[PDB]
């Protein structure tokens, strides 16, 4: 066909039906297209309506909550291809919650360059089992058709003939009066005409002539003035990779939407700039970037308050915010994960930040890209940040894996009795608020109350590594008053990378990724230590220790807290190779496929595979037919506040009684074939007998040169199929008639084994009479080296002999002619 109509910007048609028919004259609906909220229409106002001009939708086809529609053939049947740089819920054909819909129309839809087909929450939708979504799209994994009435076998379907092309399901038809033309698989990317031939290598989808892109609509090549043109002559830009529109028209569409404004990218007038691009403001060219780069984010009224994980899923695909933000999230389990996912990419906050009434935070790790705060919004009093009502906050983001710089305002930390002043001083300089010579308003009398961050380090005296246990030891530490020592808290976690610290994982209520063990104080000397309870060999773990002491009336700790170290378990024997699967694909070849060891514990140098011949069974020759921690069991289990409170109260009570007593008591003076494969998960056995079993073993060895330490041998049995090349009876069929009219037979057994010959069927025919079949058992065969007939009548007989091996029936021998005499 052709496009003689106009080009119209996308229209969000909702709650009416007047703007819809406006698209009757328009041939190219540039931009989005939303068809939803129509509950005033009825299924009696349509009888089949088609628009000549409209041939293409360019962003997405959306159908949501549409009533009074019986089929998709009442709007327009000329839809050919749905493509563009924009998508609605990542689908090209959205059919969601439609009612009275019982058929799908169109007769030109055969290819979709980009997109998917969603058909969900339907209640009368039928006609989806006659046409397959394999030659109507360019993807075979982007079809989601669920919750319909034709998936439970309740929808009937009838199509012309048992006609509709084909090269309840009968034919390939959309409706009962509209066939679906499946294109021949000789082109595979250019669709086909209603005639049934595939279009040229420049066309796509429906065409009006085969091998004639001039009359083609919706083509891989570009379209201009009425034909598919391979190239776009400048300034003509590649509009959706289907047409050419001069720079002027491109920027005119862009400005008009100011509806998915169209920009210039790779000479294409596409309205979307892929990930990693930025707006070059000379022609608004999407120029590439490294990592995320600035992009405007239209926050509602220049402000977006977040107080829940759901209220934070709107910050994705955003790099430079427009306005300020507020944080009030409380509770929640493993908040840092969703936080870093939803907004980890935010590099700059244009406005201020608020931590008012924040809860369920122990460490801030939500931001890694944040490096600059513009500060266009400031809380009255020249403040660029607020923090308050935080009594679980222990530390901020790490300062050697992150960078932040402020340009205006004063810091503010009030009512944070758990954040020590050290971090505050750190941020005084790093924040870039004390490098401007301006006094900030920060409270130090309401922060750090009954809390501190004063700690020392521990030195591991000895460490013994094993492949299932890691013993640790360290110097005996003691607080100023030995009695204050309450023990140690060995904290450990599995480190896959050498970047595991207390800032990764946890930091939120309901989740913790650092297992904790406890150690009793040392003798008042022996070095305090701990030995693991078993672990995975060849695994790297992050570990550190912390000290527990009796807190004074001010809760000042004198403990020592070692730094995080990384200890990898020792190499052990390789694990068993998972899933040994050998498949006999011929009579002499077998292909094996397996998975590598469950745990390598090194590097697999080579695999060792043995095999031996398994002869044919004997019975066959004799038988003739003629939260993030473990919580399923606790023997050491996580600690709670009550535990610490109680143990400290009891320690203090004991010490009080002891000092009391002492003061009272003291007052001052008055072989087998094998093969080896290196860094390969497949083996091919060459030269094996047909119909012969083979017991194949499979091992793996993490170390081969120092020692031959390997995994257990997994076994498998493979019975090759029997050959089927020589089943026919060989040698001449010797027929010997004697004085008694006994026609003894001397036929030879097939040369090729082909398994085993369970029997020899004979089919003779008396001239002018009915045939006769006879089964010759192996025993009788060997006894006679053929067979033997007793009682032949005068006249000629036709005899056919078909051997029967394990490769199925052979082929009947030709009729031997012997005129039996009397």
């Amino acid at each position: 066909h052709l496009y003689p109509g106009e080009v119209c910007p996308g229209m969000d048609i909702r709650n009416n039906l007047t703007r819809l028919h406006e698209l009757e004259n328009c041939s190219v609906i540039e931009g989005h297209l939303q068809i939803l909220l129509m509950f005033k229409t009825r299924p009696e106002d349509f009888r089949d309506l088609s628009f000549p001009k409209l041939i293409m939708i360019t962003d997405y086809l959306l159908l949501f909550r549409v009533y009074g529609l019986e089929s998709l053939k009442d709007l327009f049947p000329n839809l050919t291809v749905i493509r563009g740089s924009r998508l609605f819920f990542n689908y090209a054909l959205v059919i969601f919650e439609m009612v009275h819909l019982k058929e799908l129309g169109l007769y030109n839809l055969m290819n979709i360059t980009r997109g998917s087909v969603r058909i969900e929450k339907n209640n009368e939708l039928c006609y989806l089992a006659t046409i397959d979504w394999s030659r109507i799209l360019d993807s075979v994994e982007d079809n989601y058709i669920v919750l319909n009435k034709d998936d439970n076998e309740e929808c009937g379907d009838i199509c012309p003939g048992t006609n509709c092309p084909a090269t309840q399901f009968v034919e390939r038809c959309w409706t009962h009066s509209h066939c679906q033309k499946v294109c021949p698989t000789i082109c595979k990317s250019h669709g086909c005409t209603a005639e049934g031939l595939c279009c040229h290598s420049e066309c796509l989808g429906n065409c009006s002539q085969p091998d004639d892109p001039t009359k083609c609509v919706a083509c891989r090549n570009f379209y201009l003035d009425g034909r598919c043109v391979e190239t776009c002559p400048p300034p003509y830009y590649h509009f959706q990779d289907w047409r050419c529109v001069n720079f002027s028209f491109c920027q005119d569409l862009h400005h008009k939407c100011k509806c998915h404004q169209y920009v210039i990218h790779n000479n294409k007038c596409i309205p979307e700039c892929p990930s990693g691009y930025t707006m070059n403001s000379s022609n608004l060219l999407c120029t590439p970037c490294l990592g995320p780069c600035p992009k405007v984010c239209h926050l509602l009224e220049g402000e977006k308050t977040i107080d829940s994980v759901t209220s934070a899923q709107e910050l994705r695909g955003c790099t430079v915010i427009n306005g300020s933000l507020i944080i009030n999230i409380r509770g929640g389990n493993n908040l840092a994960a969703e936080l870093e996912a939803n907004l980890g990419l935010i590099e700059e906050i244009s406005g201020y930040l608020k931590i008012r009434r924040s809860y369920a935070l122990v460490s801030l790790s939500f931001f890694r890209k944040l490096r600059l705060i513009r500060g266009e919004t400031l809380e009255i009093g020249n403040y660029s940040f607020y923090a308050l009502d935080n009594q679980n906050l222990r530390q901020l983001w790490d300062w050697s894996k992150h960078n932040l710089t402020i340009t205006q305002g004063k810091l503010f930390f009030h009512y944070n009795p758990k954040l020590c002043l050290s971090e505050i001083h750190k941020m005084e300089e790093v924040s870039g608020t004390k490098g401007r010579q301006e006094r900030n308003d920060i409270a130090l009398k309401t922060n750090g109350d009954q809390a501190s961050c004063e700690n020392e380090l521990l030195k591991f005296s000895y460490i013994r590594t094993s492949f299932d246990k890691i013993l640790l030891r360290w110097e005996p530490y003691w607080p100023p008053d030995f009695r204050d020592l309450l023990g140690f808290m060995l904290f450990y976690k599995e480190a896959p990378y050498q970047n595991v610290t207390e800032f990764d994982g946890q930091d939120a209520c309901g989740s913790n990724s650092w297992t904790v063990v406890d150690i009793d104080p040392p003798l008042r000397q022996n070095h305090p230590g701990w030995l693991m309870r078993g672990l995975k060999p060849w695994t790297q773990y992050a570990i550190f220790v912390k000290t527990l002491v009796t807190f004074s009336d001010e809760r000042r700790t004198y403990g020592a807290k070692s730094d995080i170290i990384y200890v990898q378990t020792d190499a052990t024997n390789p694990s068993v190779p998972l899933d040994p699967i050998s498949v006999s694909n011929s009579s002499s070849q077998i292909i094996l496929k397996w998975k590598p060891p469950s745990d390598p514990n090194g590097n697999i140098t080579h695999y060792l595979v043995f095999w031996e011949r398994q002869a044919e069974d004997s019975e066959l020759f004799e038988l003739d037919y003629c939260y993030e921690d473990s919580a399923g069991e606790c023997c050491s289990c996580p600690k709670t506040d009550s535990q610490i409170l109680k143990e400290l109260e009891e320690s203090s009570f004991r010490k009080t009684f002891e000092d009391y007593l002492h003061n009272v008591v003291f007052v001052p003076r008055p072989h087998r074939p094998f093969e080896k494969v290196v860094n390969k998960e497949s083996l091919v056995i060459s030269g094996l007998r047909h119909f012969t079993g083979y017991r194949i073993e499979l091992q793996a060895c993490n170390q081969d040169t120092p020692e031959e330490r390997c995994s257990v041998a997994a076994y498998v049995s493979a019975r090759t199929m029997p050959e089927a090349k020589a089943d026919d009876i060989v040698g001449p069929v010797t027929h010997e008639i004697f004085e008694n009219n006994v026609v003894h037979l001397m036929w030879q057994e097939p040369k090729e084994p082909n398994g085993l010959i369970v029997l020899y069927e004979v089919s003779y025919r008396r001239y002018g009479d009915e045939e006769l079949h006879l089964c010759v058992s192996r025993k009788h065969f060997a006894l006679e080296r053929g067979c033997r007939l007793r009682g032949l009548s005068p006249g000629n007989y036709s005899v056919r002999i078909r051997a029967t091996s394990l490769a199925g029936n052979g082929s009947w021998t030709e009729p031997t002619y012997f005129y039996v005499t009397d």
């Binding site: 008053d481 000092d659 002492h662 003061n663 008591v665 003291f666 007052v667 001052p668 003076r669």
Partner: peptide
């Protein structure tokens, strides 16, 4: 009184001798 005269530092020898007679 043996904890109220020296418990936060080292205890002089005389202090120890005090609690002997």
């Amino acid at each position: 009184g043996i904890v109220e005269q020296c418990c936060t530092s080292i205890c002089s020898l005389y202090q120890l001798e005090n609690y002997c007679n």
